[PDB]
Structures are given as structure tokens and as C-alpha cells.
Design an enzyme around this catalytic site. Sequence first.
Site, PDB file in Angstrom:
ATOM      1  N   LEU H  41       0.831  -1.194   0.000  1.00 48.83           N
ATOM      2  CA  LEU H  41       0.000   0.000   0.000  1.00 48.83           C
ATOM      3  C   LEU H  41       0.870   1.250   0.000  1.00 48.83           C
ATOM      4  N   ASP H  42       0.261   2.369  -0.383  1.00 44.76           N
ATOM      5  CA  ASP H  42       1.000   3.596  -0.617  1.00 44.76           C
ATOM      6  C   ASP H  42       1.166   4.394   0.672  1.00 44.76           C
ATOM      7  N   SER H  43       1.910   5.497   0.562  1.00 44.71           N
ATOM      8  CA  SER H  43       2.140   6.392   1.691  1.00 44.71           C
ATOM      9  C   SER H  43       0.851   7.047   2.160  1.00 44.71           C
ATOM     10  CB  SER H  43       3.147   7.469   1.293  1.00 44.71           C
ATOM     11  N   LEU H  44      -0.077   7.283   1.232  1.00 49.25           N
ATOM     12  CA  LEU H  44      -1.325   7.971   1.540  1.00 49.25           C
ATOM     13  C   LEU H  44      -2.174   7.148   2.504  1.00 49.25           C
ATOM     14  N   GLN H  46      -1.039   4.699   4.212  1.00 49.12           N
ATOM     15  CA  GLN H  46      -0.198   4.530   5.394  1.00 49.12           C
ATOM     16  C   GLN H  46      -0.470   5.626   6.420  1.00 49.12           C
TER      17      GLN H  46
END
Lengths: 459, 220, 96, 157, 65, 119, 128, 87, 111, 176, 73
Positions: H41-44, H46
Site C-alpha cells: 500500500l502507498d504512503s497515503l 499509510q
Amino acid sequence: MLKYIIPTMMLMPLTWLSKNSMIWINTTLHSLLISLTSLLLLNQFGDNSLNFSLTFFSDSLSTPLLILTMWLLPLMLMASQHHLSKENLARKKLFISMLILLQLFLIMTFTATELIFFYIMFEATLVPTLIIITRWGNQTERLNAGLYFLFYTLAGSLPLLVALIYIQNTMGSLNFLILQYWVQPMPNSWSNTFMWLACMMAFMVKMPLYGLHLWLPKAHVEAPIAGSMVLAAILLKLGGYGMMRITLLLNPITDFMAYPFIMLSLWGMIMTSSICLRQTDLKSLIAYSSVSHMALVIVAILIQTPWSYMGATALMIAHGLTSSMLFCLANSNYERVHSRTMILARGLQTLLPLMAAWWLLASLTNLALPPSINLIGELFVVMSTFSWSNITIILMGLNMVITALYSLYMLITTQRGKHTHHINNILPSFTRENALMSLHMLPLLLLSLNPKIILGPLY
Amino acid sequence: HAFFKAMLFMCSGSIIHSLNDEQDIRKMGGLFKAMPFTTTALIIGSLALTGMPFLTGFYSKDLIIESANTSYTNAWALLMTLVATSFTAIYSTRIIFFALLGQPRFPTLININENNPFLINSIKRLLIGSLFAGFIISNNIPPMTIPQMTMPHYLKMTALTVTILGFILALEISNTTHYLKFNYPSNTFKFSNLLGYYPTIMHRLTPYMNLTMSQKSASS
Amino acid sequence: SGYTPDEKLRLQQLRELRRRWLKDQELSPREPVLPPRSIFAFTHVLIPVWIIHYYLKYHVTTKPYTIVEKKPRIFPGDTILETGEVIPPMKEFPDQ
Amino acid sequence: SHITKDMLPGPYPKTPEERAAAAKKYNMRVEDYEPYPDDGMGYGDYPKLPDRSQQERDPWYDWDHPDLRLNWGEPMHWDLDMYIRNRVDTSPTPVNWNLMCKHLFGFVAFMLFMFWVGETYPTYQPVGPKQYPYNNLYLERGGDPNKEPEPVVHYEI
Amino acid sequence: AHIEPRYRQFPQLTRSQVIQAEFFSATMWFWILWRFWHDSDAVLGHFPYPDPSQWTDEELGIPPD
Amino acid sequence: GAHLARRYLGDASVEPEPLRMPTFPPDYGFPERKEREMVATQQEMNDAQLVLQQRDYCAHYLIRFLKCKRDSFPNFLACKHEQHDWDYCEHLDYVKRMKEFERERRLLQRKKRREQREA
Amino acid sequence: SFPKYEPSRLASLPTTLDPAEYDISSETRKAQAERLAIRSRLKREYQLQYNDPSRRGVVEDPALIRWTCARSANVYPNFRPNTKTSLLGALFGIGPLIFWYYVFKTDRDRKEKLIQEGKLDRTFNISY
Amino acid sequence: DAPPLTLEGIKDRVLYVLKLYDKIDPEKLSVNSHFMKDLGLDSLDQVEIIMAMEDEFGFEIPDIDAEKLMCPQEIVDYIADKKDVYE
Amino acid sequence: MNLFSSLTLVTLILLTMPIAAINFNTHKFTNYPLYVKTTISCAFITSMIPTMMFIHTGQEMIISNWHWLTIQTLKLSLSFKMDFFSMMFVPVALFVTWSIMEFSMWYMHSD
Amino acid sequence: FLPSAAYLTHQQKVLQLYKRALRHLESRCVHRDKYRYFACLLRARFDEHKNEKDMVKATQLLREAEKEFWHGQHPQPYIFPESPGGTSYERYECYKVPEWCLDDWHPSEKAMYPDYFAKREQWKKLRRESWEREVKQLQEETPVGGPRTEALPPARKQGDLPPLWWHIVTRPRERP
Amino acid sequence: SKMELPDYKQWKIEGTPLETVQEKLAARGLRDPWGRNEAWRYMGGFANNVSFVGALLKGFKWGFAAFVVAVGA
């Protein structure tokens, strides 16, 4: 009265021929004995004063101030150790005997009959305070403090002598009754204006008034605790005592010539309460508080009502106790940390959990908590000045508000919210400072119960 | 009023210390039947607000506003009491809705407990006080004034009229809060929410002025 | 970004030290401390009541202008309790 | 102790050595040292700071002095006694300042004007004065035991 | 021993607090019902407010003008 | 109500001012209709320490109200019929005051507008 | 959609809408790096002279001492009497004094003349 | 207002609110798992997870840390530092 | 009435024991919340009686004693007056504060 | 204004904007379902131009985003009751006593709590035992003539404690 | 200090405002919510917590019986 004079002399060779760990109990015990001895004085009744000689007498203005002095000495004497106990034995003996000679000339001054004797004992009151604050001034400008001190008080109090000699050789002798019983009104020639200006201006210097209040703050931030308590309480209320006596003469021109001094005192009371809201050097806030209360005193003296004089003497005694106590608490905090600043020493609701009770009690007396004597004084002065004019109550109430705010800021600045947690040297509270607080705030509440003693001659 | 809001503050503090001293209405949403002694307590209090006719809160508020209506008034204060009664109705109903009968929005590991003798004694004692003491005190007063009691039509009904329209108005605001639009601040929202402007302006202007004059003019 | 390995290692030494300290802080030697060594209502609503009732007869009546009562109102159908004589009743009512 | 040259005489001039000395002394950036300037108001040579600085300094930095946002070595803006939190809070406001003062003055002015409109225009429910029984309730007002009877009556209507 | 905390479920209710909650709500409502009906009529004013005074000219005292 | 709205919007002549209600001379359409009995025995009304703005009409109902309230104190809910009758008497007083109002109102209106619209 | 948040002397400018934080030159990176270096060295000196187990007294910050000495003792030097200083001194020192002085002259002359007429409410005015 | 927290309990609560999240699986949900490597999953999202922890437990975590948690074990460690989790 | 003045002055004086008690105690009482609650309850039950006497008849009375600084044409004593407001407000305030004593027994259990 | 570097970055600046806008959307929006809808809508609005290879248009859209955010914030953004500004803000600071105290007690109470004070004394001997050499050598050993950072290295060398740890470890427990 | 973990894949969201707003956001064309979190807020002893006038209508369930008994008294 010589029954009070001569043991105050004989307390001096006591201090000389006592030894190490032997001067202390002798001085403190015997000075408390003299406190009982002058607690015996209060007999004064009805018609007039009471004459303790062809030379001494006591007005009822002089009795509570004299009892305050002989109460304040042993408190002061215990207060002035731990900052000179590690110094030399001969210098410590010289310090104690200096305070005893100081008290002796204070008793000389308060029990005056003639105004020339009063003047001699006025500057004899001056000279030990100088030596104490200069020898133990404990900071780098005690030089300038003593220099400003002596030159302001002498050069203001210098033409007072000339005016009193002129009154001496125009109206006979200078007993206070023969100053009374014979005084005639003096009209509005300009020589009368300068004579009134000379006497009233010398005591204006000693109150202080607002245009000469920078006499004070160096002389309290750079003084030891004994000289500071002496200076504040006994010297400022001694100046008020002197003006209260010598205002009996020259009433028919004081109305015409008293207008600038009242306005200077009022606007400077507002400005001084403003200036002690924001300063550092916590020791100086009590000094500017003292300037504010003495400005209120001077308003009360130049208006000439019996209401005003009762409020004036109550304000004198209550503010003397408040300022001497609060100086002693500031010395306790400076014994804790070597700062003298305000924003550094913080916290202390956790640590020393009953020192804060004494800070709270002093701060609420300086608030004029209502059963105390300070509210009695301020209230009757406000009543008398509202009968003086229907307009001055704006200044009095605004003084009350700003006084509340700076006294509360003194309370909750240094002793509220968070310890700085890099202090780690403060000791828990000794028995000595707690004993000093207990010697301050038992008589203030005990006079708060029964205050009919401390009101003035116009009771 | 004393019985009334002592009971109200005590119910509020019961809720707040029941939910870990978090105190905010957002993150409090639905707490009805989380034991309903406190929810009953708060609906008793907040419907005693404006005086559900006729309880202890009826007598004071409604005889005051009707006697003000039957008085040589200032013709604007009457409308002020009108709008103020409507407003106190609408925030009373809104605080009941957002506090109790919403959907439960409060963080987990619940620790709700009111099986507690002191709290049920205190809340019991003050609901029993605020239900009877207004009538008991208002009955046996020595009559220190002449009561009016002779009102025109549509001037005695107006108390219940304003409280009922306040209930309906807060109800329709609630059922618009059920909707989803993400509306915008229209600055009357901001004037109502942000204390409007008085503590901010005075507490940021009056300290700065006296201490600007303390530093430059007075001290230095 | 993430921790450096130095911050992680330093932080885990502080984990061990803080956990040892906090486990030391819960004292439990099974003994925390050790000791070195009708009446309410009766005394409170009798003894100050007795003292104030003694105070409010004698000293407070020897001070002359003291506790005084706004007068008990007499009504026109009553009579005086003290000596005894009636007040005349009110006159005709009608057309109510 | 304390060095004599850690005091501070005189303003900025001249620019190389005095600004270098003040950068070495007050622990600041060289071209961010700002004297006030010298209008002769006293003030020494103490720096100008961005002047609000206390509802700034967001509180998750974990500095040393927890209720003052200090870091033991900042040059400490001149008016700091007016800037301890609990004295003056200069937060960035949610709206403005001009919008605040204009709407507050407008609302209070409008409400006081409506108060004056109320004061000139009372309400009354349409009813005459009360029928006081004995000469506008005479002999029980301020005094007058036998001075003057004041005859005024009421008639049944 | 005492009540337990739970995680993300509806909390349990002991019977005493809920039965006195319903009791206090119902007794408030019983009080306001019985008090609204027994004597007052506190919503009304118990006496009829008249018209403008009687609207009866040649009564209350006028001359025929 | 709307009568005050008429008094503020419309002509202020025919709507009478409060606190200066007695304007016209008395018994202008009455003649010889007055009793003002007031048999409430004012000396007794002062003997019982009554209140200012209670030394007024319907006083003997208040006298018997206070009398029965004093004489039946533990009967806490006793005196209610005399309370209701005193309320009724003050209701009739309020009605009589409203009749006085609209008496002087309709006199001023009809007389002044009749004279100044036929003269 | 927004009037771009006019600032004031009271309303602080928040960190979001500066808009100088978005024109990042290399000079701003250089200044932020050097500012972090200064804060790093000061916290290093303070923490080493803060955690010493033999250190009994206080850490004795020269910043507070320097600020206090600048605030009180370093006012009177230095100074020159300028037009602004003398103008503001004679305004905020003498103006209110002479104003309050004249208005108390006015009130006292009113009250003296009025009680010289004798028509004042001092029928009983004992507590003077 | 003091319920005792413990390491097993905070581990269970954090893994409960991670498992309740949508676009991960309850199969490959490890304690030692990455928010960058294996969950993908992405930083967003996260920082949406970081927001979930802040909104559950009742305190902010600073953005000097929100760059660099990236795994549930260091999440448990960091709330263990904020709360000082021992009895 | 001696009963009326006596009960009002002891409603005053019942709020004087516990402050001087724990100023004089130095041995920390466990039952101190219970003690303050029961002295407020005793103040309430003493304050309920003379208000009922007040509405029962009237008898509307002032007390005034211990004059201090009776200096000029005025005087001031400690004096307070039982009319209607100071008469029968005091039970409401004592009752409210008694319930707050209960709620602060519970709410401040952990300090 | 941060301990790690001289600035945040562009990335964390956008990230703090996202956290603030999401928190303000919590404070704006009750009932949590329309909240979840609007949060996914905001996520899509940031998904519209995430992959700009440009930078100046990205920071200009960041500034215009700050304008539309500050126009659309809430009067009471929902601050948690543990945060500064919030309801608590060191709520139980009444009992957050520092631990340089508790040694200035009379030895009667030091006899009341014996084992705790013995273990505290060996804590202080642990402190003084490794204070001078390791800690002051690791401080005056690693960095440049200017420190230029606010982190500090651990004691990874062999043995004892990482430097400057006493007022970090010995803090109040934040609920006493 | 056990908790027993009322666990995942149990909520299964279905709670009608969240499900219909995922319908509306599906017609919008995003289809990426936070997910199955708030069903502990939208079911259990929850899930049609009563409307606002119901709390005011709550008073007469024990109330009318007592009122009819007092009318008969």
C-alpha cells in the site's frame, strides 16, 4: 520613656561581651522582652497625648508605630542570618550593634517633642541604614544605591531645617502643644508658599512622591534584608508620621497650594501600578507597590479630613507589615536560587507546599482582603477623597484593579505552573523562615479582629 | 435555576468522567441506553429548560415573560426575550440530540459504569428537588406583589408557542444534519461559533495596549 | 523516511532502561508502609446550640439596641395575645 | 562568572566588526541581526525578532523549557514578559482582524440603537393607573402627619 | 468482581439502574400529567380577559357628541 | 399587541398616552354614577402591617387571606377559595381599569374627530 | 473563494499560507541547515552540562543573564536625546499629568463655588 | 480514569484495527510486516493508518515520526513510548 | 424568638468546625469527606426549621452584635438580617452543595 | 522549525495538509458515513494530479489548496483531549513531581520505603559510574567543530548507557 | 488484562448510511473508501438509536398507567 530608651542602650554592650554562639540568644530574647515592654505602653486616652517627660511624649499616632518598630526588630534580627553567618564574628557583632543603634534613634525619632529634635533624630535614623546597605549591598551597584539614597534624603531634607528655625524664632518654642494652642493662620504671601513648599517637599522626598520615587528601587534591590525592612517600613512610615505632625501648622494656604501635588500623586499612583506589572527583578515589585501605597498615603495626608487621617494611619501600619513580610519572602526565594529575577524560579506548588500558603496570604493582604487592615485604610481614604471630589474615584478603582493584577501576577508567576527542572538544589523549608512568617501574620490578623487601637489621633 | 443547573452540571460531569474525561460532543455521539439513569437525568434537566408545562421551570420563566409582556416595557426587550427563548429551546434540543440519541461515536474499550451509590443518591436527590421545589416554594410565598393574571389572547399562548417552534426548528436542523452536502461557513456560523469576536478582540487588544505603554512610555 | 539504525539501537537501549526503571517503580514487598505506633448530631446541634442560646439571652439583651423584629402583622378579625382585645372586622363586601 | 564584553554598548555602526561581534555575542545569523535602529530610545543593541513567536513554535518539538518554548540559547525578544503564554496570545485568527472589529462594532451599535428606539417607544397593556384608596395612599408615604390633607378621590366606573 | 469493560460491543446493563431510570422518567411524566389536570390550568389565566373595555359607548360615561 | 402598533404607526392623537391618562373632566357622560365604597377599614389595614401598593382596592379579601393563612398554618393547602376570590376581585379591578382606558380613548377619538371633521 | 487572510499585529500568520515557504531557493535550504546546526550544538552543550551526576547547582544560562542585563542595566547607556524620544517623553509624561491636573482644578472650583453658595446637599455630611 | 494497558493487549487492538481495514487481507497480515515492501500500500493510506491510530488512542503523533513508522511493530513500540506501558 | 435566632446562628456556626479541625488535627482523618458531608447535612436540617417558621407566621428579624470601630457618627457591627431572601435561600444553597459534596466524594476519588 | 532537518520537505508539507484537512473534515462532519464518503472524495481529489513530473505547478496547486483549505476550515477543529490546545494539556500536572526530589526526605520515611530507596541509590551510582568518561568522550568525540544537528549517537561501543538519558528516562508517568 | 479480541471479517459493513454512500460514491466512480471500520458504530446495541421525539415520548410508558390510577383516585 527612658524606661524604654536605656535598655535599648544596654542591649548594645550585651552584643559586645557575648561570645560565639552566645550573642544570638541574648539579642533575640532581650529584644522580644523589649517588645513586651513597649506593649505595656498603650494607655493613651481621651483628652490629649501622654507626656513622658518635660522632653518626651506620645500621641496616639506614635504608639502603634513605636510598637511596630519594637516588634519588627527581633523578626529582622533572625531574618538577617544565613547570608552573613559565614562572615566574621566581629563584623557580625558590628552588624547587630548597628541595628540596635538604628532602633534607638528610631525610638528617639518617634517619641519626639520638638521638631528640631525630630530633625536631628530623623537624620540619625538615616545614617545606620546607609552603612548597612553599603557594607552588605551584595550587588555591583550598592555604591550608586547608597549615593542616590543619601543625597536625595539630605538634599530634600536640608531646607526643612531652615524653615523650622524660622518658625522657631517667629512663634516661640516648638513643643507640639505650643506649636498648637498658639498657631495663627498665615496668608498667601509667597514666602509662606516657599516655607510650606520646603517642609512639605522634604517629607515628599521621604515618602516618596512620584517625581522622586527613583530614590527607592536601587536602594531596595541592592540592600540586605534587614536594611530593606528598616528602610521600607520604618523610614517611609516615619516620613508620613512627620508630615502628619507638622501639617497642624499652615492650614490656610494648603488648599490653594496643594493642587499640583495631589495630581502628581494620583497620576503617578496609576503609572507606578502600571510600571510594576511588567518588570523583572521580583524584589523591585514590592518597592513600586510601596510607592503606590505611599502615593495613596500622600493623597490622604493632603486632604485634611479626620476620615482621611484614620485611613492614612491604618494604611501606614498595614502596608508596613505587608511590605516587610513580602521582602522576607523574596529573600527566602533568593536564598533558594541565586537569580533575583522573576521568570526563572518557577513551580514550587509541589515543592515547599506550605511556603505557598504564606505567599498566598501576603498576596491577599496586598490585594486588601477585606477583614484585613489594608482594606480598612484604603476604604476610608477612598471615602474621604470621594467627599473631597466626586470624580477621583476612577483613579482609585483603577489603582485597585491594576493592584489586584500585579499582586496576583507576583503570586502566580514565580510559584505556579511548572518547575524548570534544572534547579535541583532547593532545600525543604526551614523552621526559621516559617517562624518569621508566623511572626508576621499573627499580629496582622489579630489587629484585623480588633483594629480600634491603630486608628489615629482623630479617633 | 439553582436546583436546575446544579443537576445539569452534575449529570454532565457524570457523563464526562464515565467516558475518560474527553468532554467533547463530537466524539460523544450516541449514549442513550448507556445506562439510561444519566440519559433520563439529562432529558429531565433539558426539558425542564424552557418549562415543559407545567413543572418548576415553567413558573419562573413563563410568569416572568408574561409579566414582562403585561408591563410598560421597552418594546425591544420583549422581542429579545422572544428570540432568546427560541434560542435556548433550539440549543437544548440540539445538545440532547448530539449527546444521547445520535449514533455512538466514542472510542473503544468502554469503561462506562454508574452502579455507584453516591452518584445515584446525588442525581436522585436533585431530580426529586428540581421536580417539586419550584411548586413548593412558589406556592407558600407571602404575596409581595400584585399578580397580573389578565392577559390578552395570543399573549399567554406565546411561551409554549416559542418553545414548540424551537423544538421543531432544532428537529429540522437535526434532520438536515442527517443529510450529506459538506456545506460552507457563511460567517454567521462563524459569528455564532467563535465567541463572536469579543474575547478574541478584547483579550488580544487590551493586554497588548497597556503593556505597549508599560514598556515604551512608562518603564524605559 | 524512517529511522536510522543508530536511532533504533539507542532507542532500544532506552526501551530496556525505561522498562527496568518503571518495573522498579511499582513497589511491592507485600508491605508498602509500616505503622510506627449519634455523637455527631448530638454535639453539633446541641453544644453550639446551647452556647449560642446562652449567648442570645443574656449578653445580647443587655446590649439594648440589638436583635429586633419587624412587627407581627395583626389582622382585623383577630385579638391581641398579650392583654386581650379584638380588632373591628371589615365592613360590607358586595357585588363580587 | 561573566565576561565584561558579554555586555552590550552602542548600536550597529560600524558594519564589519560590530555586526561580527554581535553575531558572535547574541548567537544569531549574521545578516539576521537587526538593531531597532538608534532613535535614542535606549534599547541598547538588542535584536528585533518576528515579534509574535509564542502562539507560534508548535508544541511537539520537545525543547527544554516546557511552558516557554525556550531552547536555552535564543536571543529572547525584548518584550518577552508580555509574551509568556498566560499573558498575550497572538494566534493566527480564524477570520481576520478588520472583519472582527467591523462586525463587532456594527452589532453593538445596532443593538444600542434598537435599545434607544425601545426607550422612546414603550409598551403598555391598555390600563389606567391604580385606584389608591386614601388620597394616592397618603399618610403612609414619606411623612406629613397633620400638615396638609391632599384631597383626590376615585369614582366607580 | 465488578462490571467488566468490553471492546466494540454494546455494554451490558444491570437491571437496577435501568429500572430506576425508567421509574424517574415515568414519575416526572406522572407528576406533570397529574399537575396539569388536578387544579391548574397554569397555561390559562383562570379569568376571562375582556374586550376593549366593554365597547359600550353611552356606558362608562360620555356625552353624545 | 396591535393596539400599541397602531399607537406607534398611526395618528397619536386618538390613542391616549399612558401615565397621563386623566385628561378630560369627570362624569361627562355618567352623571351621578359613583360609589367607591372602600369599606376595608384603613386603620385596621394599617394595624395589620400591609405593604405599599397593597393599601388598595379588594383589601379585605387580603385581610381574610392572611388571617386564615396564619390561623391555619399546618393546614398547608387550606386557603384557596379566598385566594381565588381575591384573584377575581383584582380581575374586576383590572377590567375596570381597561374600561377607564377605552372610555377616555373613545371620548378623545369620537369627540375630537367629530368636532374637527364637522367644524 | 477566500479574501487571502489579511494579517494584523495580533492575528499571527500561520505556517500554511505564507506563501514564502513555496519559493524554496538554495539560500533557504542553507539557512535551515545552519539553523539546525546551531540548535544541535546548543542542545549538545546543554545536555552534556545537564545530565552530569556531580552537577549540583543550576545550569546558569547566559541567554537569560544576557537578556536581563540588556533589559534593565543596558538602557541608560546607550542613549541620545532625539526628537522622537523627547517628543514622546514630554507627551506621555507631562500630558496626562497636566490634563488630570486641570480637570481636578475644574471639579474643585465647581464644588467650592457651589458650597460657597450654600445650596449643596450637606444637610448632614459629617464623614468628610 | 486508569485502565491498565499491556503489550499483548495493545498488539491485539492495533492488529484488530489493521484487520478491519479494507484493502489488506486477514491472511497475510503479519506483526513484522512492511507498509512498503509486502503489503504494497502507498504512503497515503499509510498515513490514513496513522490517523486511525491517532483517532483510536486519543493523541497526535508528530510528523517527524509519521515519515518513518512503516510497520506495526514500531507502531506498538511508539505508543508504548507515549504511554510507558508497565503496571 | 430565641429559637429563631438560636437556630440561624447555629446554621452559621456549624460551618466553622471542620476548617479549624483539620488545622488542629495533624492526624489525617480517613472519614473527612463523610464528616464534611454530614456537617452540611446537619446545617441543612437546622436551616429547614426557621424558614418554615418564617412562612408560618412572619416574625422578620435582624441580629446585630460585636461592634468594632464605632468611630464617628456611624458604627458597624457584625449583623445579618432574616428577611425572606437571606431567610429562605440558604436551604437551597446548602442542599445543592450537599449533593455536590456527594458528587465530589465520587468524582475526586483519585487525588 | 523541527529537530531533524532545516525544513520539512514538499512531501511532508502536502502530508500535513492532508492530515489537517481530514481532521477538519472530521470536525465538520458528524454521522461518520457521509464523512467516509467525503474522505474518499478528498482522496480522489488528491489522486487527480499526484503524478506530476512538474514541480512548480505542484507547489502552486499546493498554495491554492491552502487557500481553499483556510477558507473552508472549522471554528473548532477537533482537537483530542490529550493534545496541546485540547481539553487536557497536562491535565494531571498536579502530581507530575520531578525526581530530583524524594531524596530530601527525613530518614523516618526513608525507613518507611527501604527497598525502593536502596535501588534508587544504586541507580544513582549507575548514573555517576558511567558519567564522566564514556558520556563526555562520546560528546566531545564524534561531531564537527559545529554540531549542526539535534540528534545524538547511542553508546553502541561496548557496554553502558547511551549518553544524556537521565531527564529522558526519569520523567513523570503521565497519569499518576 | 485479557481482551479476547472481538475480531475482523465479522463487521461486514452493510450499515445503511455507509452502504448507500458507497453506492453514491460508486456512481461517482471512486470505489475506494476506508471500509469496514465503523460497523461497531452502526450495529450491535446501536443501529436505529431512537429518533429525537421518541426520547420525549418515552415518558408515558409507565406514565399513563399511573396517571389513570391517579384520575381514579
